[model samples]
Target chain A: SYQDYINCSREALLEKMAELLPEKRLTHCLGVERAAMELAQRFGVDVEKASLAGLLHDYAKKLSDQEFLVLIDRYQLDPDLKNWGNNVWHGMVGIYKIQEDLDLHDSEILRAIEIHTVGAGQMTDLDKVIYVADYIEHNRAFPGVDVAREIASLSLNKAVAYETARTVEYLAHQGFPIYPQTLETYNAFVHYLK
Target chain B: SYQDYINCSREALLEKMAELLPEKRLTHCLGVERAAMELAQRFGVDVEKASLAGLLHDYAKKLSDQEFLVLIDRYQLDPDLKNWGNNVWHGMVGIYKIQEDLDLHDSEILRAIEIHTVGAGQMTDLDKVIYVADYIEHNRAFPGVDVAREIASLSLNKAVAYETARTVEYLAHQGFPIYPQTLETYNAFVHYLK
Candidate 1:
């Protein structure tokens, strides 16, 4: 069963991730796993599932752009994805590869993997946990990471809302066009604030 | 004819605007008119048309929320518009009121008025003129206004591109869900810089 593999051995998954990812990304994934476990324990979600999802969220990050593009078509991913760069394509396109390569077919884990980078409109607790974990993981350092870590401890919804707003603002300031899903996430999470 | 009204008397239009708008907004409109003329002369667009579009661009700025809501339904504007505030609704909802109240139906003039607040994907020269004029008008004192004015002096397309980028950043920073047309304008004009 998918849960069998997830529950089987943490060391085996970590070893595989180390082999597949770069040194920096491997460390970041470990940080996300730790963070996700902590959040899961607080939110009363399954810690093992959250840890696995966080560790494997960026499983396809190392794929070459050409390889990613080919997989995008092979998997029948959204065609509009072709318009964006790797920053967007990786998470949306990566989940399929994670499922195929790792044989992890749990829909909840796959959805968490799918949305770790750009969050979805209706995020499950696992989704928010993984998303927030990836963002506020110890290795991640940005201007407002501390604030994110602080808010994250209080409410998952508020953390997602704050992070989405911060990320969109940062991207726009850098002259990058925002993805529509990110905007939808912003609108969805903002409702929780008011 | 609509063209005749647009062409006949700048003073008459200004007089009507002064009567319609608060003193502060009227002054801003006049400043935008002055700025639009300057830009028109530099870009070789028709000064009178630019002036008229700029002067009347905010003619509906003073509408009450109730009045704008009524107009939004009266004209069958996009339903999504109700989600935004007057800052977004005014240009879109205002144009219809301008046509009904002022009886000016020139498409060029109306399009300019429509897009002045949130620019369109394919802007006419008049569209770019009014958009930049409203942003960099003398009374407009925002953090980036000077830089916008400097860019405006160099190239109209570049100025519009810069301003679109800047405005989206500001909105995102303020936690506002950006209107989609604004994103379209960013995509359209960002190409000009490269």
Candidate 2:
């Protein structure tokens, strides 16, 4: 019955998301939700809870850049987003919206959403699981996806470190932006390993 | 002698400084000035130029926090420093005062002053000298002072690596409020070393 409830929530959220989002983004969100559910099961997490957060992770995805800026200004997200001008708007704005609109005030869920794109230092199990799921989902095809998946099935602690190192290395090699928080998260994971 | 010139400038600046500052800060300024000069000689820089820059490095040190904020606002210095509250204010404000009042338009001197506290990656001999001088000055007794001083006498590149590592390690340990520019400086130094 609880699984049914979770399934219903997932379907309903997906339906609403599809109406509001482009097809490609809708597909991506669905993929991440499925991956989140699978990871939750693997990690003995409450799959329903993870599924709810995953399903709605990209609820604000389809908003225009102007809409994103307005949301950022309204919520007082970091202003560097204005200069970076990319996907950062989504994760932060989505966290705010989930609180303001959906009344989902769980810090655990909110933080997982908030830091999905940029790992904050000292992530909770929920945050790490969701982040790794999002990064290594089947739909995602990146350089080290297989290793990430294998590590994902093995150990959450090592998975986080492995994912963080890969994420940092990937960003650096591509000359992409690397935030300090990312390094701090990597440092935290490394410390946890030690 | 050039030392006399720097001492004269230091005296002039400190005379004006006494009107705005307490004795403690003035002493620190002199210490930093002497350190800068020693570093300059060891690294074969123009000792007079480095000493003058160092003594007056904190020319704006007497400005109240409110005054500092006003300068930061006027100059559009990165708002990221809001968390640290004057930790690195000297550089930005020092550059401003040197340019406006002292009529010192040398970019190299100004840059050395600006990045003295925050090692602006892969520094020139002048830059490294100023950074190390501030780090291992006689009156300064930080943890790595002796090691940093020894490295300073070795070579510019080694000195840069030591100072840069020291900055990163100290900042990491202090858990200081950081900005992306600081991380960029560290990354740039890493690249410089590689």
Candidate 3:
């Protein structure tokens, strides 16, 4: 509760996110927030920041390639980022929107938002909580979600590894271009699976 | 057969390879040579170079990690090479042994050996032949080999992509570290498949 206003309170973020986009996305962010906050309590992370990070993970999910590219160029990010699709662009580039628009400047939260999609070679407890919750969040419903939720309940790291391994496996088989960061996260976390 | 002896005759190289190791490995090398020569005919790569490259692809397969690491250090290669295991070390590090011990020094042959295991972002026709042949060569027998052989018969790059994707998938599931070069190969070639 103390950190609920580390930048701004939960109610304020929800209103900002709602004002910015569709009801469906807002609902999904709430799903991420509920799951991330639940995990924070389970894993001893800062509940407010976890809530803050998850609630804002998809803040820029509705933006066009032109919009993301402008931010990417303004931020002086890698040119190769242009080649990837929205599945990649949204999270890695969403931090700029989160930082400037929401006035939320915590590195942990921003980095969690940055890597929630493609993960990193290294991750904090907050990062693990956000990523796993994003996949197994209660508001989501899928057969895969059932499997991940079961694993997430047991051990945080193992769940993170499973999610990443599955994501990488699917992308590789589909002939998708896997970024080095995705591979780095896969190599870094996959070892915890077996 | 003219290109077979680009550095030395096939017979002389066989003798050197035999002196360097076991009959089992020699048999596999011969298998690679046969399949590589076979693919070269199909794909228009120089049959001799494909066979030559395949015959020497695993030239360092039998060396110890310590030996490879010593060579890696001597060559002023990346220190990270020390952290990986033999599955990676054999091909990426084998070119040095191929060069120093056998005095076999054609860039085409050397580069083929260099990429035979993990593969690279870009590959020549010679590289594709050796890489595919190494996977489906006659001495190998497995369920997966049958599948890959079928693909290899139809298209060289398709087989290479399938093999890299499969190898990367297995390693990821087994929690093994997937190297950047392996991902590079996967991204560059996987698109060749339907």
Candidate 4:
């Protein structure tokens, strides 16, 4: 019945999401999938690919914190990067899950999930789209939503810079947790512009 | 009284140490002073002068953490050195406090106090002796102590390198806090050897 509303291969992706998490979290992943698809379409990027990655991006999102730590270490993720929180794990683990289980091994899609929170210097167009779309998706409304959405209408590079710099500056000011890669991303974009 | 340990001119230094901190910490300072003096004597360095600086080096150690923070900020300590704890602050604050109160304005004594924890390149013999003595002091016992103290008694550059290497290795392994000066000192000693 839910499959009728959107042109997504909803049943298959929802099954994958549920296999990785509890029912409730699977539902949230679906919502993110739909939101990412709509945002990508609005920005003239591929809607189906973004939605597919987004749907499965948080597939392991509901693992217990301890299990998350164990799996991260077992998988040999950089020790320095592992101790950080779910914001980073969501992308990295999503890449691993999709590549390992589903055999969807496109580097662009993997990187799109990898840098959803932290843009990288050589981010592909799809990576920038998912990164920006996750923040500026239609259903999201935060303090800087309008500005970010406006920037998204321009080139992806400009939009990525604006979003990355604004996010990093805000997080640093609040003393909230952030990956060092986020700062590196912002610095790279600024350096690129200069 | 402990005041009788040194002559009247340097009596003020011992009293100054007592005024600033708990008796136990003052005793450690005195031990370090004695150790430095012995090392200086053996190495044909200035014993009395280095002992006085070493004895009173931590004279401001009693300041509360908040006061330490304020003073460090006020002095505009090197940015890389900020946010570190007592390990780095002890020497810099010692220099500031000694200069402020005791008028121990001789550059050799002041340089000895300043560079005791962090080695300075182009260090005077007094500087090298105090720095090495602080680590190899009799009461100090940790791994590699004998080798460090033995090399220290022989060559200044070798002593500085061993001490700097110990610090660098410890800081890296413990993820203990670091100040820029420590890194700089380690770099200088390593490069000087090259």
Candidate 5:
């Protein structure tokens, strides 16, 4: 099943992504794919899977809030998700739809998409690759992107840990309701730092 | 009944604090009391209650980790707390010990001590006073203390919001496992800013 999704030509996958996502989002997805592939090579993970996950990570990003809400009910997602808004629903709730509609059933790829936004407690190499790739993709421009990119070139673990801390710090400073999973990821990665 | 605790003489309370807390901690407590009194006057909360809550907030801070563990079992605190270290246990687990050992049973006073370290979603005026006072106390030498002190001089709500954001930011940047209540407090305060 994973082979089925992975073997599907990258061009076909890009066409599907282009069909669903806006031109800007499609460009961003390709950037994530390039970053993910580079990380996958460095970490000795499956490059095809990492690229596929990154490309499809925001498959449902363009869906309206109402569509996400409908998918939440249709798929029986965590009910607490109702309290959150689009920033959270896109990655988390989108994964289930990707699995159902796009027939992308590889759990690892789906999970990379699932956690690409908030991250999770026990992240696989693929997960870390996608998470960091999505964050430090070439197009990303922010206060900490340079530092993140520098660390990413040295160690994937350190990069993921840095990104995790920076993301949580930025959200907290903005007074955002941090997803509990983000805290769990922070806890897990912080332990490695110690 | 609440008045019984509130009405306790401030001089006697300081003496009790001196006897129970270490000299350094006693100094911090007094600083918090002074700071709390200032905030209370500005916000029109009961100054006596605010001072009392501040002085007694860390009543059990000197207790050993083993002692806090015993208290957690004795009071049936959220068992999940067992996973945390003294930094977290002191405030959350210490409240029960203060209530039982110190016989300070006013829910408001108890809650102020309970939340002084982590804070809560719905903080009372006294709660906000104690929380901000504890952070911006004269002896509290931190990166954000000056900004916190500045905001505290203007509005209690804005000061609490700023402190909440800053505390969470500091903890996250330090790779600390942030308590959920701290996030809840951040969520509650950020809404006002919006």
Candidate 6:
């Protein structure tokens, strides 16, 4: 009685999301999907595509570190990709693996997954939905996470900037080396708002 | 009095390093720890912290090609790390090696160990301590290593600039791929005062 995204019926899709991953992994993935659908609906973007990406964003979550390296080589990615760790791999490098195994071919969906974690200088509405949803999803429990959801109600653009600023500050405060483009996203969003 | 951060004093350290290191490499390690202590005291950092990072930062220095790859997988390190060779592993991945063998997770030491090799855009005092110490240690014999120590005596910041500039120059001359963060460190510190 309802239309669904590319691969399945609406009922089929929810089932896919359910059997899609481990118990712990699926809960957050499901929340992200739910959040992505809600945010996309409000923003006038395609909910089907965005929700599909949200549910699949972390498709490579449990991959071996060896498989990540193989995917890097298989895709002939930037060699500098090695400098980052799994915190980076699951988003930045996962897309290519998702492409092959998950059989996803949509450019917008793929792009959303690529920039979800590190973010980018240029982002589309779908990108912001997935990025923001991953952060403010009800399942996430970090400090200031609620503020991200609070801001999301007002402006998706502002939500993106706020989420980025929090992470940049946290990494610097915690004395960790930040990935380069995450800073670019912060810098990019600052100019976006101004 | 009792064992210091890890095993004990310098005398105890040499005995501990046994099947573990190249003779000259251990000599270099000694030079670095001494330099780190002096630099830390000069810069008003933790002398004990800097020396330990200096002594232990290269704990994986002798890992084979196979072993380094194993560490990258075992710790879920940035898979891109494999793109680099032992030149990076001993410092960047050395933090984990130290954690397992040395019983040290002290973040100050851990953070310093990770960045001491490649350096980063923003560095803490302890990061700078081991970074410059590794470059300007008495065992160093590179073209600019001596002058770096002379500058190090006056300013740790300039020493970072001097070493970073010279290394980027060497990489460019040899047609090597410059890692992004390494270039960032050069950019952030090249001006000496900012």
The numbered model that scores best in lDDT is 3
**Model 2 chain A worst lDDT run, 10 consecutive residues:** A1-10
Every model's TM-score = 0.93, 0.53, 0.89, 0.47, 0.87, 0.52
TM-score of chain B of 1: 0.91
The worst-scoring run of ten residues by lDDT in candidate 4 chain A lies at A1-10
User: How do the residues A59-171 of candidate 2 rate in per-residue lDDT, one tens digit apiece?
Assistant: 77666788777877997878877755446667766666656655677677778888877777777777877888787767788777898788888787778777776666555
Candidate 3 lDDT at B167 equals: 84
Give the alpha carbon lDDT tens digit for every residue of B1-194 in model 1: 22574544666777777888899999999999899999999998888888888888999898888888998898788888888878887888888888887678788888998889889889999899999999999998988788899989999999998898888777767777777788778877876655
B37: Cα error in model 1, Å = 1.8
Docking outcome class, model 5: medium
Name the lDDT value of residue A71 in candidate 4.
Answer: 62
Q: Per-residue lDDT of B1-194 in model 3, one digit per residue for the tens?
A: 63334566667778878987799989998999899999999999988788888888888888988999998899998889887878888888878877787676678888888889888989999998999998898889876898899999899889999999888877765667788889899988878878
Ranking by TM-score: 1, 3, 5, 2, 6, 4
Cα displacement (angstroms), candidate 4, residue A188, comes to 16
lDDT of 3: 0.85
A46-165 in candidate 1: lDDT tens per residue?
898898888888878888888778988998888888888778877888887777777778888888888887898899999999999999999998888998999889998989988888
Q: Per-residue lDDT tens digits of candidate 5, residues A24-68?
A: 888999899899999999999899899889888888897788888
The reply for model 1, stretches above 4 Å from the true place, is: A1-8, A191-194, B1-3, B6-8
Model 6, global lDDT: 0.79
RMSD of each: 2.3, 11.4, 2.8, 14.9, 3.1, 17.5
List interface RMSDs for the candidates, in order: 1.8, 7.5, 1.3, 15.1, 1.4, 12.6
Task: Go through the candidates in order and give each one's DockQ.
Answer: 0.59, 0.06, 0.63, 0.03, 0.67, 0.02
For model 6, the chain A TM-score is 0.89
TM-score between model 2 and native: 0.53
Over 4 Å off in model 4, which ranges?
A1-194, B1-8, B73-81, B191-194
